[PDB]
Design brief:
monomer; about 325 residues; alpha+beta; Jelly Rolls; 10 helices; globular; binds N-oxalylglycine; binds magnesium ion; binds nickel (II) ion; binds zinc ion; transcription regulation; zinc; EC 1.14.11.66
């Protein structure tokens, strides 16, 4: 078995190997990459996502989210308070302000220490989940707006044609902006490109050990667990590396820098934080190997998780027994 310790693997494809996206994902899996839940892909030196980022300031962040924490430094939840619209140029200026900017630090490890010590005492503002793309249309390789769609994959594998679409999302971050512990909708893959700016630190639990994280989460967030049998679908709970190590939960960490891709694998729980002003693009995708994960994915039916239009068909076809209850939670 390849990668039996479930380490995060880093790949350096050549420009030739960068042509065929599906083939490269299958290659990484042949080497055991998926066992970690997360892999890094450093693009060939010849590749670029677009020519420059000089003209992005007029993108609108219609609903910036202030991430307000509750709990203790290593075990907390966050809620999202909606803020007034602002442009990316306005948000960048805010991120760089004395109130929100990255503090002085020695290295990534020092900054990680400061994040876990101090995150709860601040409320950073995240421009998340913005439909759109920063890839130039002429970028042919690993262009996250030109991927094969999940609907087409389900149709190829299973023969059933379904409604729905699959488009990317932009994320504008600042120091301390946080993504809570989650797997993807329907335990899909994700791919995330850091277009510009400061790094993003990731934590990940191997898929084979995801239920260990779920059991800890039920212990640590006991009211939330009574409220919903899949409350990590709400995407609000944080648990620090120190707490994970105290509780024997297997995990790994890595920092993504500008110009790098990350892939999350089916049922790979992940969480993390941004170092400073940045912009990422991410989208979900599927492969043949996903289908069995999609069939077994948990679902929130309490009403909190509320997701896209396109998830309806996935539930309906892959999980017909759950459909009725899950759809009630959507309506
Ligand atoms: O970058 C973020 O805030 C969150 N991204 C992801 O969870 C992802 O790409 O799967
Ligand atoms: Mg612009
Ligand atoms: Ni994710
Ligand atoms: Zn729920």
């Amino acid at each position: 078995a390849q990668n039996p310790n479930c380490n995060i693997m880093i790949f350096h494809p050549t420009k030739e190997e960068f042509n065929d996206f599906d083939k490269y994902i299958a290659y990484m899996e042949s080497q055991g990459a998926h066992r970690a839940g997360l892999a890094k892909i450093i693009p060939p030196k010849e590749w670029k996502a677009r020519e420059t980022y000089d003209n992005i300031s007029e993108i609108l962040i219609a609903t910036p989210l202030q991430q307000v924490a509750s709990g203790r430094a290593g075990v907390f939840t966050q809620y999202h308070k909606k803020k007034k619209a602002m442009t990316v140029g306005e948000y960048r200026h805010l991120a760089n302000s004395k109130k929100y900017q990255t503090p002085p630090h020695q290295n990534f490890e020092d900054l990680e220490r400061k994040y876990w010590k101090n995150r709860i005492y601040n409320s950073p503002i995240y421009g998340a989940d913005i439909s759109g793309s920063l890839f130039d249309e002429n970028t042919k390789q690993w262009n996250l707006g030109h991927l094969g769609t999940i609907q087409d994959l389900l149709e190829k594998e299973c023969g059933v044609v379904i409604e729905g679409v699959n488009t990317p999302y932009l994320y504008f971050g600042m120091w301390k902006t946080t993504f809570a512990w989650h797997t993807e909708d329907m335990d899909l893959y994700s791919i995330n490109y850091l277009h510009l700016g400061e790094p993003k630190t990731w934590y990940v639990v191997p898929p084979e050990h995801g239920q260990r994280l779920e059991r800890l989460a039920r212990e640590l967030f006991p009211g939330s667990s009574r409220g919903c049998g899949a409350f990590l679908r709400h995407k609000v709970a944080l648990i620090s590396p120190t707490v994970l190590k105290e509780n024997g939960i297997p995990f790994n960490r890595i920092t993504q820098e500008a110009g790098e891709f990350m892939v999350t694998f089916p049922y790979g729980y992940h969480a993390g934080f941004n170092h400073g002003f940045n912009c990422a693009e991410a989208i979900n995708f599927a492969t043949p190997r996903w289908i069995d994960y999609g069939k077994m994915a948990s679902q929130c039916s309490c009403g909190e998780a509320r997701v896209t239009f396109s998830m309806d068909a996935f539930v309906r076809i892959l999980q017909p027994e759950r459909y009725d209850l899950w759809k009630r939670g959507q309506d």
